[PDB]
């Protein structure tokens, strides 16, 4: 409960889906393009590609990752896709 802010998830992402047994909130922070899961600092690889970002994060038993794609000149609009084995994940977003 931020005392700040209201609706502009423009420079964050989120991802709600069911794991660990319970409804899992997974989030794209744009400060350090890290994830976060169940309040801790989710351990990605930050490998940069010759255009986008494959976050590689493990998740207990599983093998998670954020699909990242730049767009535009060169970083004009960025788009984060959460994934969990081999699945796509909706977005807070629309």
Known sequence: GPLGSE???????TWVLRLDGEDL???????T???????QKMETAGEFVDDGTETHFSVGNHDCYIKAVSSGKRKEGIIHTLIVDNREIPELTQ
């Open 25 to 31: 909130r997974v989030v794209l922070e744009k400060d």
């Open 7 to 13: 609706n502009r998830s423009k420079t964050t992402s």
């Open 33 to 39: 393009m890290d994830v976060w899961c169940n309040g």
